[PDB]
Amino acid sequence: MAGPVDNIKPMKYNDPANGVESSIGPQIHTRYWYKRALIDAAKEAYFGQL
Amino acid sequence: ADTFSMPKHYGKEIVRLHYIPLLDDRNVNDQGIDASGATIANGNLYGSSRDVGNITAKMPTLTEIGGRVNRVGFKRVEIKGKLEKYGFFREYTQEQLDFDSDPAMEGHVTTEMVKGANEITEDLLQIDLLNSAGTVRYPGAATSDAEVDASTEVTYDSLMRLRLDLDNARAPTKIKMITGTRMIDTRTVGNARALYVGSDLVPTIEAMKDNHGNPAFIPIEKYAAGGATMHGEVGQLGRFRVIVNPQMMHWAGVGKAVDPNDQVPMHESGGKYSVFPMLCVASEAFTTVGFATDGKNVKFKIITKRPGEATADRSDPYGEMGFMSIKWYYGFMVFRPEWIALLKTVARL
Amino acid sequence: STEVTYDSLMRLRLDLDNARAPTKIKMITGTRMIDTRTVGNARALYVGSDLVPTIEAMKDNHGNPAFIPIEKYAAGGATMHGEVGQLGRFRVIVNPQMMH
Amino acid sequence: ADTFSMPKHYGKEIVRLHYIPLLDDRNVNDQGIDASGATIANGNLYGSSRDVGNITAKMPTLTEIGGRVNRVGFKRVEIKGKLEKYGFFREYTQEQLDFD
Secondary structure (H helix, E strand, O other): OOOOOOOOOOOOOOOOOOOOOOOOOOOOOOOEEOOOOOOOOOOOOOOOEE | OEEEOOOOOOOOOEEEEEOOOOOOOOOOOOEOOOOOEEEEOOOOOOOOOOOOOHHHOOOOOOOOOOOOOOOOOOEEEEEEOOOOEEEEEEEEEEEEOOOOOOOOOHHHHHHHHHHHHHHHHHHHHHHHHHOOOOOOOOOOOOOOHOOOOOOOOOHHHHHHHHHHHHHHHOOOOOOOOOOOOOOOOOEEOOOOOEEEEHHHHHHHOOEEOOOEEEEEOOEHHOOOOOOOOOOEEEEOOOOOOEEEOOOOOOOEEEEEEOOOOOOOOOOOOOOOOEEEEEEEEEOOOOEEEEOOOOOOOOEEEEEOOOHHHHHHOOOOOOEEEEEEEEEEEEEHHHHHHEEEEEEOOOOOO | OOOOOOHHHHHHHHHHOOOOOOEEEEEEEOOOOOOOEEEEHHHEEEEEEHHHHHHOOEEOOOOOOOOOHHHHHHHOOOOOOOEEOOOOOEEEEEEOOOOO | HHHHHHHOOOOOEEEEEEEEEOOOOOOOOOOOOOOOOEEOOOOOOOOOOOOOOOOOOOOOOOOOOOEEEEEOOOOOEEEEEOOOOOOOOOOOOOHHOOOO
């Protein structure tokens, strides 16, 4: 479920996207953006040609 | 598999946008002025419906005066992907090398460790592919892992239904049909797609009959004269090309209790049946994610420290031990989960 | 009890012939390749994707499969867009947008 | 069949070594440390197992702090050969060759 005992507890990067925020403080960006959208293909016609 | 290089200062997540078409059931909206003019909670114009009676009642009709009628709208969706880290180490002492009878032990050990590390990534990729796939089919009134019995075996109808389900999602085929040749004792083969199966299902595949009481398996030797062959190919079962992967996994121990009153061996483990997968995965659907790879080639990071006075410290003022460790990153993120198909069956008919 | 049968398709073909409907697909007299088949005159016939399983499991009046896949007679060559085979004297075309 | 020439002053036996891989069931040792820094009495890392359930629980994994986790080890084995001697003879007399 996790690693071994810490016994140190330094300035970490605990998961900010859900739950515990951070050591330094608030974050600006927590995810990278894929700039190319996913578009479905067009359908096909069988009766129009005839 | 393709690889995507995640940037350094954007966290541990990737997000992508998806655009829904107009005539779709996922396009729930509120711009709903109808033919006569009225706000209704339907702004997609009968989207994704194939009933004639329903369709010829929401068709957008117009009069000679026009007016505010037949408004529509659009929507958006998003998808996500993640990351993770892995690693392992090994330590030894100095006297193990000086007093061993084999002077070449170190090289063999290092090569074995590197080679073993080179397979964990493949195992991770296979596990990720298996655990993230839609359109899971159980042949015959099973619908779950807890209802798998000796009668839940792969048949021709199940394969045909799986192919139909794959085609309904507009998955792309990549293997063309062969019409035959002049070569005596050959057979014709239609267009198909790759299908990876383990080596434990070979006896079952060799003993399967089609809907008309004939052997459905066409060996590679029959049609290889006029066609092409890829690595690991053993033949075409239905409209799929079977590829035997020696490292394919399975679910051992899941299923119903074994019934001794059956005429078939039915591979078992721990008093219960076993489930074997048949996977049809198409490229350009999923992708892999790496990190801290400036040149994309250094996936592994290795740190080694030999015994001596460079590892003195205060817990061992003599320095009698050394170690070596490997660490790396890995992530998976999938588009179109309906383009990966899985069929769960039993073995050894 | 109202399902596709070879007798129904034969009756439909006879009814169409009684109306002097035209046929635009010729017959394949044969090829020199091993494991091929010969088919007669036929006309196009559009079906939805949900009727494939029942079509694939049809038997004629002699206990033999009736659906001949496209791979068997493709040496001659008609190969229309969505054609997948010849069931009786009809060329079956699967239309992904068929209504019901 | 191949042939190997045994040296003189070494006896009548040949011994050879064999090295076992890491992800194997024959690599049985006591250098295993779990992903939570605990001994597990096995260090072959789920070797020679093709169960989806067994894997994904013995995978290495790592956190920010690291620590002493995921230890491994290796082994080796031996094989042997042997040798023997054979022979036979024949006897005769002089008069058998002259008055024949």
